[PDB]
């Protein structure tokens, strides 16, 4: 029927068909679809239709000190469309509009699908804080509120565990053996192997693998990890399914192949390529502490998330678990001290979680919550108390952590989890969260066979509750990016390689962009407030980068938009943009951290969205150019950069503002990059705006600690009065990140596992970079040594890349 045409629209939006059962050996996925219906409807029938349509973007956080100093009269001016209006920072939208008349009209931002509404001071609106920080005037049009009817939704034993290894099969390709692990949170409970047989296209064993664990000692979420060594292939089977039933019967599991640790290795999904992939065939038929110990316990609790716990430490934590329960910071280490392979201990663990008044009353610590949601915890009861703390996150904070909460779904043992349901709720409650939730989920569905099925089921559940209006937006957005990505590919084939630009390329590009325009208006995926109209064909070009990316520019479809600037987007194939997304988001989290301490390092975390395999889109920051390109124009010469700034800034005052913007923006990327270990970059990959705002680009796949070349130093003048500022802002910013050391360490390690090509040694860099277990005095001295290395080295590393 027509209801089945609705499901075909969902499939096109998703990029995957969730009704397909071609790759399932149980009904867990469908069971989850049905299970997600409840949380969907509960959030739909509970959200306010009015605020849902206007979707006010608001924060409950305080107004930073560096923004108060920009309003030195306690008078915020709002230009309504037109007379300017004197307003107090604590003036509510209603008190402003009623003061405007002296009835149901609403204030909407010019050139944006954004609204300033609700019981909140204008001081607490994100669009207002943006205008203030960037010294812009708040322009708004008195418009009629969007029809809430547009958001309407289409209503809907003591025996040891045994495994029978029959054999492996592959029509492709030493000696191989089968290793079967019983795993829980990457903790190998017991391990058994087969005998090494000749590696042929068919290898049968017909052997029972005896494990040391009993059947009723198997914890929920425990994985049967089956691996082949010559390690070339792996595959997993949940031993207890979504119905708490011990898994039994025959299985033919198509395994994933290894390339020559990370989240993919954990998935319960089987390889969908049954034609080429290796197969496996199996059979299942079944007082209080003394002073000295308390100090040792507290010392253990105080260490970082990456500090390994010894057997003694674990035994200590467990025996004094009720003492450890009083410290929320002890929870990650405590639950790592649990013998999950023992039913009795798991029981005591649950009774311990029964009364958790301290944990329930503690202030929300995201860094501590994330640690409970990573690969080290499979127990759903432990993970639930994590998602519990997330519930107190305001929408502004959900957006901060959305990308890596979505990635964290990869660490969930089952498809239907508290973490999934949480994202679903918060996505249906806020259109901005829902919008980015769509693109984050869709990003993984398109280039991850390991998790596309789970993410698809989740995306379908969101799409059925977001409302008919947003379904229309997503469809337009999807249709446009599909057209543009086609043009991106065809143009890449024509240029080939070793040719900067051809006459025939500029011809075909402007030809296809003309043909393609005959998609009236689409929402900008990386900036959902902005809508894009007709292409500015004359501005469109191929940038002549290594991959020949498209430089496209559009017109804003909003006539109320004051300016006439175009919306720029770069389409690129060849780079894995999922890595740039993760880095950029961490940059935003660093900005957020710095805001807590009234800092502003002027980072420019541009918009970036992965849409497919090595393909996606990148926001174009206006009036920006490469620092290396600035050297090629006049020429190695260090005087150049300051010369370029004077040229672009007409007034002498605007120039000093650029140098102020520079010393700030410079310091921000110095600290951020070193902490993340991406500071040693080529001059080409660093850009600057005409207003002196420095920023890095292209974070995919990445000797000096970072980049502070003499050309940058010349802009500072060198010791100088503003270099003293630079050395000052860095230590302030650096020591500020160390105050959130645990949060940064967990996000970093998660970024490596869920988005990078990843062993223990890789993560430990950020720990050293953050000077773990060091005094603030010594740490400040550490970072300054790093600054001096950029001085002593000069262009030594800079010149090297030229080969
Ligand atoms: N993974 C990637 C890929 C790209 C690339 F566009 F494909 F090259 C970029 C990037 C962004 C950018 N930005 C992003 C911020 O807004 C301005 C454009 N400018 C450039 N340039 C290459 C250049 C060399 O001179 C061509 Cl004109 C400038 N490159 C970043 N990350």
Residue numbers in the entry: 145 to 225, 230 to 250, 268 to 321, 357 to 373, 379 to 435, 460 to 489, 497 to 522, 545 to 776, ...
Excerpt from the publication:
A 3.2 Å resolution crystal structure of the PI3Kγ catalytic subunit (p110γ) in complex with BKM120 has been previously reported. At this resolution a precise positioning of the BKM120 molecule in the p110γ-binding site is not possible. To validate the rotational orientation of BKM120 in PI3K, the asymmetrically substituted BKM120 derivatives PIKiN1 and PIKiN2, as well as their relevant regioisomers PIKiN1-R1 and PIKiN2-R1, were produced. Interestingly, PIKiN1 and PIKiN2 bound to recombinant p110γ, p110α, p110β and p110δ with a 7–30-fold higher affinity as compared to their regioisomers, which was also confirmed in a p110α activity assay measuring directly PtdIns(3,4,5)P3. To clearly determine the orientation of the substituted morpholino group, a bulky chloromethyl-azetidin-methanol substitution was introduced: here the orientation of the pyrimidine core of PIKiN2 bound to p110γ could be unambiguously determined in a crystal structure resolved to 2.51 Å. Its core pyrimidine C–H group points towards Tyr867 (position U in Fig. 5e and Supplementary Table 8). Closer inspection of the p110γ–PI3KiN2 and p110γ–PI3KiN3 complex structures revealed that (i) the core nitrogen in position V is hydrogen bonded through a structured water molecule to Asn951 and Asp964, and (ii) that the trifluoromethyl-pyridin-2-amine group and aspartates 841, 836, 964 coordinate two additional structured water molecules (best resolved in the PI3KiN3 complex). Molecular dynamics simulations with BKM120 docked into p110γ demonstrated that positioning of the pyrimidine core C–H group towards Tyr867 kept the structured water network intact (CU–H). In contrast, when BKM120 was oriented as in the initially reported structure by Burger and colleagues (CV–H), hydrogen bond interactions between the inhibitor, water molecules, side chains of Asp964 and Asp836 were disrupted.
Phosphoinositide 3-kinases (PI3Ks) promote cell growth, survival, division and motility, and signal through protein kinase B (PKB/Akt) and the mammalian target of rapamycin (mTOR) to control cellular growth and proliferation. BKM120 is a potent PI3K inhibitor, but has been reported to also act as a microtubule-destabilizing agent (MDA). We succeeded in separating the activities of BKM120 as a PI3K inhibitor and an MDA by minimal chemical modification of its core pyrimidine ring.
